[PDB]
Amino acid sequence: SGAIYVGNYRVVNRHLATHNDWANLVWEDSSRDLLVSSTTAQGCDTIARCDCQTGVYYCSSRRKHYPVSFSKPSLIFVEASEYYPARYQSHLMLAVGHSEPGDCGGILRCQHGVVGIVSTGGNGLVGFADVRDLLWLDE
Ligand SMILES: COc1ccncc1CC(=O)N1CCC[C@H](C(N)=O)C1
Ligand SMILES: [Zn+2]
């Protein structure tokens, strides 16, 4: 689990979203595994507006933060699961690192702020859903 709280928004993995999240839907995108919902409290997370390719992420399956190098956001093929069939997920960034399904939601951070959240993984790889392009999270 895990979410980003910025301003009047909550950013979660679309596969892990709750009933409240859908009842207060702002935006959702299946191809990105992203869901944004409205909140009754003001969020304090800073979203990075950058080109960074290095950061640190939280891996709850290890109770540790890991520094990683990661790829530019792109379309990557993701194996079929119980939430989605076999498809290309967009805005996805891969890194070499420990990952487990319950690890989705873990924040990826750089010097500039929050980059995105854990969304895919397996075989010594971890994939992060990018949120740096969503300029409206600040306006
Ligand atoms: C962090 O997740 C994992 C890590 C290691 N083995 C497996 C996983 C699980 C994973 O990749 N998923 C399953 C749930 C939906 C995901 C998606 N975006 O389509 C894909
Ligand atoms: Zn940055």
Curated annotation (Swiss-Prot):
Q: Which reaction does it catalyse?
A: Selective cleavage of Tyr-|-Gly bond in the picornavirus polyprotein
Q: Which residues bind Zn(2+) 1?
A: 50, 52, 110, 112
Q: Where is the active site?
A: 15, 33, 104
Top-level lineage group: Viruses
Q: Describe the function of this protein.
A: Cysteine protease that cleaves viral polyprotein and specific host proteins. It is responsible for the autocatalytic cleavage between the P1 and P2 regions, which is the first cleavage occurring in the polyprotein. Also cleaves the host translation initiation factor EIF4G1, in order to shut down the capped cellular mRNA translation. Inhibits the host nucleus-cytoplasm protein and RNA trafficking by cleaving host members of the nuclear pores. Counteracts stress granule formation probably by antagonizing its assembly or promoting its dissassembly.
What is said about its interaction partners and assembly?
A: Homodimer.
Listed name of the protein = Protease 2A
